[PDB]
PDB file of C-alpha atoms and ligand atoms in Angstrom:
ATOM      1  CA  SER Z   1     113.127  77.771 113.268  1.00 43.21           C
ATOM      2  CA  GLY Z   2     109.476  77.486 112.302  1.00 46.74           C
ATOM      3  CA  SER Z   3     108.961  81.204 113.112  1.00 50.26           C
ATOM      4  CA  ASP Z   4     106.311  83.298 111.386  1.00 50.03           C
ATOM      5  CA  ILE Z   5     108.953  85.731 110.016  1.00 46.96           C
ATOM      6  CA  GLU Z   6     110.844  82.798 108.505  1.00 44.87           C
ATOM      7  CA  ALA Z   7     107.597  81.474 106.970  1.00 42.54           C
ATOM      8  CA  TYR Z   8     106.999  84.956 105.399  1.00 43.09           C
ATOM      9  CA  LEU Z   9     110.551  85.117 104.033  1.00 44.69           C
ATOM     10  CA  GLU Z  10     110.175  81.600 102.575  1.00 42.15           C
ATOM     11  CA  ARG Z  11     106.919  82.744 100.924  1.00 42.98           C
ATOM     12  CA  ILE Z  12     108.719  85.606  99.194  1.00 46.00           C
ATOM     13  CA  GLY Z  13     111.797  83.512  98.308  1.00 45.40           C
ATOM     14  CA  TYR Z  14     114.097  85.690 100.475  1.00 44.73           C
ATOM     15  CA  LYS Z  15     117.118  83.486 101.353  1.00 45.65           C
ATOM     16  CA  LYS Z  16     119.580  86.192 102.319  1.00 41.83           C
ATOM     17  CA  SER Z  17     120.676  87.726 105.599  1.00 44.19           C
ATOM     18  CA  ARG Z  18     118.448  90.229 107.348  1.00 42.68           C
ATOM     19  CA  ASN Z  19     120.899  91.388 110.054  1.00 43.33           C
ATOM     20  CA  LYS Z  20     121.714  94.749 108.436  1.00 48.64           C
ATOM     21  CA  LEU Z  21     118.773  97.167 108.702  1.00 50.08           C
ATOM     22  CA  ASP Z  22     119.911  99.247 105.714  1.00 48.51           C
ATOM     23  CA  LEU Z  23     118.520 100.522 102.399  1.00 46.84           C
ATOM     24  CA  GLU Z  24     119.954  97.524 100.487  1.00 42.78           C
ATOM     25  CA  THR Z  25     118.180  95.025 102.750  1.00 41.49           C
ATOM     26  CA  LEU Z  26     114.926  97.030 102.789  1.00 42.22           C
ATOM     27  CA  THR Z  27     115.030  97.219  98.964  1.00 42.80           C
ATOM     28  CA  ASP Z  28     115.774  93.531  98.611  1.00 40.29           C
ATOM     29  CA  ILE Z  29     112.767  92.610 100.819  1.00 36.85           C
ATOM     30  CA  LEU Z  30     110.439  94.970  98.930  1.00 37.00           C
ATOM     31  CA  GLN Z  31     111.582  93.475  95.629  1.00 34.66           C
ATOM     32  CA  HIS Z  32     111.151  89.884  96.799  1.00 31.61           C
ATOM     33  CA  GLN Z  33     107.629  90.669  98.058  1.00 29.20           C
ATOM     34  CA  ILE Z  34     106.448  92.407  94.900  1.00 30.52           C
ATOM     35  CA  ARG Z  35     107.797  89.518  92.693  1.00 29.54           C
ATOM     36  CA  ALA Z  36     106.069  86.922  94.908  1.00 26.44           C
ATOM     37  CA  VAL Z  37     102.852  88.373  96.394  1.00 26.65           C
ATOM     38  CA  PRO Z  38     100.386  89.562  93.801  1.00 29.29           C
ATOM     39  CA  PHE Z  39      98.372  92.757  93.965  1.00 29.60           C
ATOM     40  CA  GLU Z  40      94.920  91.189  93.527  1.00 29.23           C
ATOM     41  CA  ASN Z  41      91.230  91.359  94.487  1.00 32.80           C
ATOM     42  CA  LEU Z  42      90.043  87.957  93.224  1.00 33.12           C
ATOM     43  CA  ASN Z  43      88.311  87.056  96.556  1.00 35.87           C
ATOM     44  CA  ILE Z  44      85.750  89.754  95.782  1.00 34.97           C
ATOM     45  CA  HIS Z  45      85.031  88.029  92.433  1.00 33.99           C
ATOM     46  CA  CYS Z  46      84.800  84.570  94.027  1.00 39.01           C
ATOM     47  CA  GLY Z  47      82.109  85.771  96.517  1.00 38.54           C
ATOM     48  CA  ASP Z  48      84.558  85.942  99.458  1.00 38.61           C
ATOM     49  CA  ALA Z  49      85.721  88.717 101.845  1.00 37.28           C
ATOM     50  CA  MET Z  50      88.841  90.906 101.811  1.00 40.40           C
ATOM     51  CA  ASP Z  51      89.993  90.461 105.416  1.00 38.84           C
ATOM     52  CA  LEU Z  52      91.841  93.281 107.144  1.00 40.41           C
ATOM     53  CA  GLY Z  53      93.243  91.428 110.124  1.00 44.08           C
ATOM     54  CA  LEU Z  54      96.848  90.299 110.130  1.00 43.29           C
ATOM     55  CA  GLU Z  55      96.209  86.703 111.215  1.00 43.78           C
ATOM     56  CA  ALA Z  56      93.879  86.202 108.235  1.00 46.78           C
ATOM     57  CA  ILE Z  57      96.166  88.033 105.791  1.00 47.95           C
ATOM     58  CA  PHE Z  58      99.256  86.088 106.961  1.00 48.47           C
ATOM     59  CA  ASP Z  59      97.341  82.816 106.473  1.00 47.29           C
ATOM     60  CA  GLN Z  60      96.056  83.704 102.997  1.00 47.76           C
ATOM     61  CA  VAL Z  61      99.349  85.166 101.694  1.00 46.45           C
ATOM     62  CA  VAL Z  62     101.908  83.026 103.542  1.00 47.45           C
ATOM     63  CA  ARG Z  63     100.120  79.651 103.819  1.00 46.11           C
ATOM     64  CA  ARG Z  64      97.691  79.787 100.865  1.00 42.06           C
ATOM     65  CA  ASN Z  65     100.099  81.553  98.440  1.00 41.87           C
ATOM     66  CA  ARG Z  66      97.614  84.338  97.638  1.00 41.62           C
ATOM     67  CA  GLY Z  67      98.126  88.112  97.285  1.00 41.05           C
ATOM     68  CA  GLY Z  68      95.774  90.943  98.164  1.00 42.29           C
ATOM     69  CA  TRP Z  69      95.000  94.598  97.733  1.00 42.98           C
ATOM     70  CA  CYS Z  70      97.019  97.401  99.362  1.00 43.83           C
ATOM     71  CA  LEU Z  71      95.274  97.163 102.757  1.00 44.23           C
ATOM     72  CA  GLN Z  72      96.422  93.510 102.921  1.00 44.13           C
ATOM     73  CA  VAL Z  73      99.847  93.351 101.231  1.00 45.45           C
ATOM     74  CA  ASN Z  74     101.153  96.515 102.926  1.00 43.44           C
ATOM     75  CA  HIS Z  75      99.737  95.400 106.308  1.00 45.91           C
ATOM     76  CA  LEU Z  76     101.767  92.194 105.930  1.00 43.35           C
ATOM     77  CA  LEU Z  77     104.844  94.074 104.645  1.00 41.26           C
ATOM     78  CA  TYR Z  78     104.523  96.490 107.601  1.00 44.32           C
ATOM     79  CA  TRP Z  79     104.422  93.562 110.069  1.00 47.02           C
ATOM     80  CA  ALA Z  80     107.422  91.841 108.371  1.00 44.11           C
ATOM     81  CA  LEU Z  81     109.615  94.927 108.197  1.00 44.55           C
ATOM     82  CA  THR Z  82     108.811  95.893 111.809  1.00 44.01           C
ATOM     83  CA  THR Z  83     109.524  92.362 113.025  1.00 45.66           C
ATOM     84  CA  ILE Z  84     112.886  92.384 111.194  1.00 48.08           C
ATOM     85  CA  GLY Z  85     113.668  95.596 113.055  1.00 50.23           C
ATOM     86  CA  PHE Z  86     113.015  98.530 110.683  1.00 51.33           C
ATOM     87  CA  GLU Z  87     111.545 101.807 111.992  1.00 51.84           C
ATOM     88  CA  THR Z  88     108.115 101.792 110.343  1.00 52.45           C
ATOM     89  CA  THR Z  89     104.949 103.932 110.143  1.00 53.86           C
ATOM     90  CA  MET Z  90     101.600 103.314 108.437  1.00 50.41           C
ATOM     91  CA  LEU Z  91     100.372 106.127 106.195  1.00 50.43           C
ATOM     92  CA  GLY Z  92      97.141 106.753 104.349  1.00 49.95           C
ATOM     93  CA  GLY Z  93      96.618 108.092 100.886  1.00 49.97           C
ATOM     94  CA  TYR Z  94      94.231 109.123  98.143  1.00 49.92           C
ATOM     95  CA  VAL Z  95      94.393 107.627  94.644  1.00 49.05           C
ATOM     96  CA  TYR Z  96      94.355 109.721  91.492  1.00 47.87           C
ATOM     97  CA  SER Z  97      91.663 109.148  88.864  1.00 51.99           C
ATOM     98  CA  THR Z  98      92.187 110.420  85.308  1.00 50.63           C
ATOM     99  CA  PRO Z  99      88.424 110.737  84.503  1.00 51.86           C
ATOM    100  CA  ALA Z 100      87.704 112.482  87.818  1.00 51.84           C
ATOM    101  CA  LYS Z 101      90.730 114.780  87.333  1.00 52.21           C
ATOM    102  CA  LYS Z 102      91.329 114.495  91.080  1.00 55.42           C
ATOM    103  CA  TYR Z 103      92.354 112.259  94.005  1.00 56.68           C
ATOM    104  CA  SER Z 104      89.829 109.987  95.708  1.00 59.67           C
ATOM    105  CA  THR Z 105      87.590 111.688  98.231  1.00 63.36           C
ATOM    106  CA  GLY Z 106      88.323 108.909 100.727  1.00 64.52           C
ATOM    107  CA  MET Z 107      91.537 107.474 102.115  1.00 63.66           C
ATOM    108  CA  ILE Z 108      91.722 104.249 100.110  1.00 62.81           C
ATOM    109  CA  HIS Z 109      95.512 103.642 100.040  1.00 64.39           C
ATOM    110  CA  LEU Z 110      97.733 102.160 102.784  1.00 67.47           C
ATOM    111  CA  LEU Z 111     101.443 102.804 102.360  1.00 64.81           C
ATOM    112  CA  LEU Z 112     104.462 102.760 104.685  1.00 64.12           C
ATOM    113  CA  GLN Z 113     107.241 105.054 105.899  1.00 65.28           C
ATOM    114  CA  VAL Z 114     110.639 103.550 106.867  1.00 64.19           C
ATOM    115  CA  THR Z 115     113.328 105.678 108.544  1.00 63.52           C
ATOM    116  CA  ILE Z 116     116.896 104.457 108.254  1.00 61.66           C
ATOM    117  CA  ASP Z 117     119.754 106.203 110.071  1.00 61.87           C
ATOM    118  CA  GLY Z 118     118.682 109.750 109.203  1.00 61.04           C
ATOM    119  CA  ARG Z 119     116.863 109.174 105.857  1.00 60.40           C
ATOM    120  CA  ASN Z 120     113.076 108.777 105.401  1.00 61.85           C
ATOM    121  CA  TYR Z 121     111.479 106.645 102.721  1.00 60.95           C
ATOM    122  CA  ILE Z 122     108.141 105.486 101.569  1.00 61.35           C
ATOM    123  CA  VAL Z 123     107.615 101.780 100.836  1.00 59.84           C
ATOM    124  CA  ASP Z 124     104.540 100.379  99.026  1.00 58.67           C
ATOM    125  CA  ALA Z 125     104.030  96.822  97.644  1.00 59.64           C
ATOM    126  CA  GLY Z 126     100.371  97.437  96.804  1.00 59.74           C
ATOM    127  CA  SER Z 127     100.181  99.648  93.740  1.00 60.40           C
ATOM    128  CA  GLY Z 128     100.873  96.937  91.146  1.00 63.28           C
ATOM    129  CA  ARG Z 129     100.819  97.094  87.363  1.00 64.97           C
ATOM    130  CA  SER Z 130     103.245  99.738  86.012  1.00 62.68           C
ATOM    131  CA  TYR Z 131     102.626 102.026  89.065  1.00 62.60           C
ATOM    132  CA  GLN Z 132     104.694  99.846  91.399  1.00 61.30           C
ATOM    133  CA  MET Z 133     107.969 101.147  92.853  1.00 61.95           C
ATOM    134  CA  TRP Z 134     110.834  98.622  92.744  1.00 61.67           C
ATOM    135  CA  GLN Z 135     112.825 100.542  95.372  1.00 65.03           C
ATOM    136  CA  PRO Z 136     111.935 102.681  98.395  1.00 63.83           C
ATOM    137  CA  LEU Z 137     111.407 106.348  97.488  1.00 64.31           C
ATOM    138  CA  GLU Z 138     113.198 108.940  99.552  1.00 65.06           C
ATOM    139  CA  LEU Z 139     111.022 111.690 100.962  1.00 66.99           C
ATOM    140  CA  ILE Z 140     112.718 114.582  99.120  1.00 69.88           C
ATOM    141  CA  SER Z 141     110.370 116.999  97.409  1.00 70.23           C
ATOM    142  CA  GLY Z 142     110.894 117.490  93.662  1.00 71.47           C
ATOM    143  CA  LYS Z 143     113.714 114.977  93.238  1.00 70.77           C
ATOM    144  CA  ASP Z 144     113.672 112.586  90.299  1.00 70.53           C
ATOM    145  CA  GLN Z 145     114.137 108.986  91.435  1.00 71.93           C
ATOM    146  CA  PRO Z 146     114.811 106.756  88.404  1.00 72.70           C
ATOM    147  CA  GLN Z 147     113.862 103.089  88.672  1.00 72.96           C
ATOM    148  CA  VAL Z 148     113.311 100.182  86.236  1.00 72.59           C
ATOM    149  CA  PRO Z 149     109.556 100.814  85.967  1.00 73.67           C
ATOM    150  CA  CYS Z 150     109.804 104.579  85.422  1.00 73.69           C
ATOM    151  CA  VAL Z 151     111.119 107.762  86.982  1.00 76.21           C
ATOM    152  CA  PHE Z 152     109.205 108.488  90.182  1.00 75.50           C
ATOM    153  CA  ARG Z 153     108.873 111.885  91.868  1.00 73.69           C
ATOM    154  CA  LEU Z 154     107.574 112.894  95.240  1.00 71.87           C
ATOM    155  CA  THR Z 155     106.508 116.513  95.764  1.00 74.64           C
ATOM    156  CA  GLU Z 156     105.414 118.137  99.049  1.00 77.30           C
ATOM    157  CA  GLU Z 157     102.903 121.023  99.167  1.00 76.15           C
ATOM    158  CA  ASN Z 158     101.051 122.287 102.289  1.00 75.84           C
ATOM    159  CA  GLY Z 159     101.418 119.048 104.325  1.00 74.99           C
ATOM    160  CA  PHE Z 160     100.493 116.733 101.433  1.00 75.92           C
ATOM    161  CA  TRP Z 161     102.856 114.539  99.472  1.00 80.32           C
ATOM    162  CA  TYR Z 162     102.194 113.676  95.811  1.00 78.41           C
ATOM    163  CA  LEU Z 163     103.659 110.588  94.108  1.00 80.24           C
ATOM    164  CA  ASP Z 164     103.947 111.007  90.322  1.00 80.20           C
ATOM    165  CA  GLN Z 165     105.744 109.092  87.548  1.00 82.81           C
ATOM    166  CA  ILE Z 166     107.270 109.827  84.160  1.00 80.39           C
ATOM    167  CA  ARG Z 167     106.389 106.892  81.981  1.00 76.91           C
ATOM    168  CA  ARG Z 168     108.065 105.465  78.836  1.00 77.59           C
ATOM    169  CA  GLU Z 169     106.534 105.223  75.394  1.00 78.17           C
ATOM    170  CA  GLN Z 170     104.414 102.117  74.963  1.00 76.67           C
ATOM    171  CA  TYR Z 171     104.641  99.592  72.144  1.00 77.98           C
ATOM    172  CA  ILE Z 172     101.403  97.559  71.867  1.00 75.02           C
ATOM    173  CA  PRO Z 173     101.950  94.908  69.197  1.00 73.96           C
ATOM    174  CA  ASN Z 174      98.346  93.713  69.317  1.00 73.09           C
ATOM    175  CA  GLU Z 175      96.503  96.747  68.032  1.00 72.10           C
ATOM    176  CA  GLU Z 176      93.077  95.221  68.768  1.00 69.21           C
ATOM    177  CA  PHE Z 177      93.804  96.648  72.249  1.00 69.83           C
ATOM    178  CA  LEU Z 178      94.936 100.122  71.284  1.00 70.36           C
ATOM    179  CA  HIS Z 179      91.548 101.570  72.418  1.00 69.64           C
ATOM    180  CA  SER Z 180      91.411  99.540  75.643  1.00 67.16           C
ATOM    181  CA  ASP Z 181      90.302 101.312  78.855  1.00 69.76           C
ATOM    182  CA  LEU Z 182      93.367  99.627  80.410  1.00 70.20           C
ATOM    183  CA  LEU Z 183      95.860 101.951  78.677  1.00 71.46           C
ATOM    184  CA  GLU Z 184      97.366 105.127  80.202  1.00 72.02           C
ATOM    185  CA  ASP Z 185      98.340 107.190  77.136  1.00 70.42           C
ATOM    186  CA  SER Z 186     100.159 110.032  78.907  1.00 68.46           C
ATOM    187  CA  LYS Z 187     103.839 109.895  79.817  1.00 70.36           C
ATOM    188  CA  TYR Z 188     103.062 111.926  82.993  1.00 69.21           C
ATOM    189  CA  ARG Z 189     100.822 110.245  85.561  1.00 67.56           C
ATOM    190  CA  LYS Z 190      99.718 111.247  89.069  1.00 67.35           C
ATOM    191  CA  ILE Z 191      99.580 108.076  91.179  1.00 65.42           C
ATOM    192  CA  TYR Z 192      98.482 109.050  94.707  1.00 62.12           C
ATOM    193  CA  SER Z 193      98.772 111.675  97.434  1.00 62.81           C
ATOM    194  CA  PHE Z 194      99.229 111.161 101.177  1.00 66.05           C
ATOM    195  CA  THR Z 195     100.284 112.744 104.428  1.00 65.39           C
ATOM    196  CA  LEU Z 196     102.885 111.633 107.002  1.00 65.35           C
ATOM    197  CA  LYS Z 197     100.287 111.358 109.797  1.00 64.59           C
ATOM    198  CA  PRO Z 198     100.784 108.021 111.550  1.00 68.52           C
ATOM    199  CA  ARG Z 199      97.887 105.601 111.098  1.00 68.61           C
ATOM    200  CA  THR Z 200      96.686 102.325 112.624  1.00 70.56           C
ATOM    201  CA  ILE Z 201      94.904  99.597 110.713  1.00 68.34           C
ATOM    202  CA  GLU Z 202      91.642 100.621 112.395  1.00 71.27           C
ATOM    203  CA  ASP Z 203      91.686 103.817 110.315  1.00 72.50           C
ATOM    204  CA  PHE Z 204      91.178 101.749 107.112  1.00 71.53           C
ATOM    205  CA  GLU Z 205      88.309  99.513 108.216  1.00 73.57           C
ATOM    206  CA  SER Z 206      85.369 101.621 106.928  1.00 76.75           C
ATOM    207  CA  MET Z 207      87.016 101.766 103.480  1.00 74.78           C
ATOM    208  CA  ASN Z 208      87.907  98.039 103.661  1.00 76.56           C
ATOM    209  CA  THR Z 209      84.186  97.285 103.856  1.00 76.60           C
ATOM    210  CA  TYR Z 210      82.977  99.944 101.420  1.00 74.72           C
ATOM    211  CA  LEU Z 211      85.539  99.118  98.680  1.00 71.11           C
ATOM    212  CA  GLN Z 212      84.160  95.482  98.667  1.00 73.52           C
ATOM    213  CA  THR Z 213      80.504  96.406  98.459  1.00 76.52           C
ATOM    214  CA  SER Z 214      80.114  99.752  96.669  1.00 73.41           C
ATOM    215  CA  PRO Z 215      79.171  99.602  92.958  1.00 69.69           C
ATOM    216  CA  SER Z 216      81.258 102.818  92.784  1.00 70.06           C
ATOM    217  CA  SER Z 217      84.416 100.948  93.826  1.00 71.39           C
ATOM    218  CA  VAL Z 218      86.902  99.933  91.119  1.00 71.30           C
ATOM    219  CA  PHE Z 219      87.447  96.788  93.203  1.00 74.14           C
ATOM    220  CA  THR Z 220      83.895  95.578  92.594  1.00 73.60           C
ATOM    221  CA  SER Z 221      83.999  96.662  88.894  1.00 73.33           C
ATOM    222  CA  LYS Z 222      87.108  94.809  87.674  1.00 72.53           C
ATOM    223  CA  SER Z 223      88.694  91.534  88.786  1.00 70.65           C
ATOM    224  CA  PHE Z 224      92.489  91.756  88.653  1.00 66.78           C
ATOM    225  CA  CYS Z 225      95.809  90.333  89.658  1.00 67.54           C
ATOM    226  CA  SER Z 226      99.300  91.741  89.106  1.00 69.49           C
ATOM    227  CA  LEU Z 227     102.819  90.466  89.795  1.00 71.20           C
ATOM    228  CA  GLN Z 228     106.172  92.143  89.092  1.00 69.98           C
ATOM    229  CA  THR Z 229     108.825  90.067  87.299  1.00 67.58           C
ATOM    230  CA  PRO Z 230     112.595  90.629  87.147  1.00 66.72           C
ATOM    231  CA  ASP Z 231     112.044  92.864  84.088  1.00 67.78           C
ATOM    232  CA  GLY Z 232     108.378  93.768  83.821  1.00 68.75           C
ATOM    233  CA  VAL Z 233     104.883  93.014  85.099  1.00 70.55           C
ATOM    234  CA  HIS Z 234     102.116  90.517  84.463  1.00 71.22           C
ATOM    235  CA  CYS Z 235      98.557  91.803  84.959  1.00 72.79           C
ATOM    236  CA  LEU Z 236      95.241  90.085  84.272  1.00 71.09           C
ATOM    237  CA  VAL Z 237      92.161  92.285  84.247  1.00 69.18           C
ATOM    238  CA  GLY Z 238      88.860  90.528  83.585  1.00 64.77           C
ATOM    239  CA  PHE Z 239      89.648  88.160  80.684  1.00 63.78           C
ATOM    240  CA  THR Z 240      92.547  90.306  79.429  1.00 68.16           C
ATOM    241  CA  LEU Z 241      96.065  89.085  80.207  1.00 71.96           C
ATOM    242  CA  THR Z 242      98.907  91.567  79.804  1.00 74.30           C
ATOM    243  CA  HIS Z 243     102.668  91.356  80.122  1.00 77.46           C
ATOM    244  CA  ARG Z 244     104.793  94.444  80.121  1.00 78.75           C
ATOM    245  CA  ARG Z 245     108.546  94.381  79.622  1.00 78.15           C
ATOM    246  CA  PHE Z 246     110.128  97.566  80.955  1.00 75.22           C
ATOM    247  CA  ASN Z 247     112.549  99.423  78.654  1.00 74.29           C
ATOM    248  CA  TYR Z 248     112.594  96.663  76.071  1.00 76.19           C
ATOM    249  CA  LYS Z 249     114.131  99.043  73.431  1.00 78.12           C
ATOM    250  CA  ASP Z 250     114.868 102.759  73.262  1.00 79.41           C
ATOM    251  CA  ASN Z 251     112.928 104.303  76.196  1.00 78.30           C
ATOM    252  CA  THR Z 252     109.900 102.126  75.338  1.00 77.26           C
ATOM    253  CA  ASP Z 253     107.944  99.482  77.219  1.00 77.48           C
ATOM    254  CA  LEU Z 254     106.452  96.539  75.361  1.00 78.66           C
ATOM    255  CA  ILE Z 255     102.944  95.473  76.359  1.00 80.84           C
ATOM    256  CA  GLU Z 256     101.523  92.147  75.176  1.00 78.50           C
ATOM    257  CA  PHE Z 257      97.754  91.622  75.326  1.00 78.94           C
ATOM    258  CA  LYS Z 258      95.745  88.401  75.059  1.00 82.16           C
ATOM    259  CA  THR Z 259      92.109  87.497  75.603  1.00 84.39           C
ATOM    260  CA  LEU Z 260      91.641  84.420  77.753  1.00 86.88           C
ATOM    261  CA  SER Z 261      88.754  81.991  77.704  1.00 87.12           C
ATOM    262  CA  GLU Z 262      87.132  81.176  81.025  1.00 84.34           C
ATOM    263  CA  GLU Z 263      88.708  77.730  80.785  1.00 82.08           C
ATOM    264  CA  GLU Z 264      92.246  79.227  80.325  1.00 83.10           C
ATOM    265  CA  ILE Z 265      92.160  81.528  83.411  1.00 82.25           C
ATOM    266  CA  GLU Z 266      92.784  78.752  86.019  1.00 82.67           C
ATOM    267  CA  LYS Z 267      96.026  77.597  84.382  1.00 86.41           C
ATOM    268  CA  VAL Z 268      97.253  81.188  83.895  1.00 86.93           C
ATOM    269  CA  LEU Z 269      96.516  81.991  87.545  1.00 84.28           C
ATOM    270  CA  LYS Z 270      98.635  79.056  88.673  1.00 80.96           C
ATOM    271  CA  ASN Z 271     101.452  79.227  86.143  1.00 82.75           C
ATOM    272  CA  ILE Z 272     101.985  83.003  85.943  1.00 82.52           C
ATOM    273  CA  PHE Z 273     100.793  84.213  89.382  1.00 80.66           C
ATOM    274  CA  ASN Z 274     100.957  81.079  91.586  1.00 77.78           C
ATOM    275  CA  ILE Z 275      97.317  81.744  92.508  1.00 77.73           C
ATOM    276  CA  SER Z 276      95.053  78.815  93.349  1.00 76.97           C
ATOM    277  CA  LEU Z 277      91.548  79.945  94.183  1.00 78.91           C
ATOM    278  CA  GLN Z 278      89.143  78.409  96.760  1.00 80.18           C
ATOM    279  CA  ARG Z 279      86.069  78.787  94.519  1.00 81.11           C
ATOM    280  CA  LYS Z 280      85.084  79.680  91.006  1.00 82.86           C
ATOM    281  CA  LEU Z 281      86.208  83.140  89.843  1.00 83.22           C
ATOM    282  CA  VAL Z 282      83.673  85.183  87.969  1.00 83.46           C
ATOM    283  CA  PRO Z 283      85.953  87.464  85.869  1.00 82.93           C
ATOM    284  CA  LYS Z 284      84.694  90.988  85.427  1.00 82.47           C
ATOM    285  CA  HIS Z 285      85.700  93.941  83.328  1.00 84.80           C
ATOM    286  CA  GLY Z 286      83.353  96.736  84.297  1.00 84.90           C
ATOM    287  CA  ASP Z 287      83.685 100.399  83.327  1.00 81.65           C
ATOM    288  CA  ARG Z 288      85.407 101.905  86.473  1.00 81.38           C
ATOM    289  CA  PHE Z 289      88.864 103.492  85.947  1.00 78.65           C
ATOM    290  CA  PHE Z 290      91.822 101.124  86.329  1.00 76.53           C
ATOM    291  CA  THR Z 291      94.818 101.220  84.049  1.00 78.33           C
ATOM    292  CA  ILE Z 292      97.793  98.881  83.788  1.00 77.64           C
TER     293      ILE Z 292
HETATM  294 NA1   NA I 301     106.233 100.808 113.597  1.00 81.35          NA
END
């Protein structure tokens, strides 16, 4: 056809039918996107902007085979799902920080609601690492929702929703990384909180700018890119390449770590992530909180 929706589906390798607007189809699209479109911020670390507009995001993701951060990849996913015919809403959320022992002061997370024939879900392709849902989560307070990455749980209290996870044990064969700031040691992790108040993309613009410029922003502190695989997740942070295999053995995830040279990053970006940059990346591994 040459249509934009068909271009997007080609980008994510989705070759199936999209005529049934059901949970199976929604899940399949989510899965294809998270296995194709990385969660990344490498433009920041190449001296370029993180654009918020859909035309620019569609070009960079669909035509230039890039990914983006949540404000980008969920904006695109929102457009695609809506175009396909799903009943969609943009939502805003607040990300948990272990060191801060609280959720972000500002609304730094874009996620989606999809309503299908009497059930309500959240859908998010922009958490990445081992925080990334592989299926839509039903909006049912307190219910365990087991998935390949982990068991997720949504809880409602006083008009706020709280997304948490119960994580597996971790096997780290390269013990030179045991003390890495990248590792979440607890099996219980708060991910983010949000409300069901409908948003527009305009609501995220002030944060879109500030997250690119503030020395306080994790996004200026660490350069990263993440992509889900059929059984795990690849994530590069700074010069540190990781690969997690979910539930490799006995309720345990395996996490491989390797240090890359500057010269090795370009080939990894292409071969593992299908990322080809426009300019030279300056990899960074600053001190701000970001676990894999
Ligand atoms: Na909508």
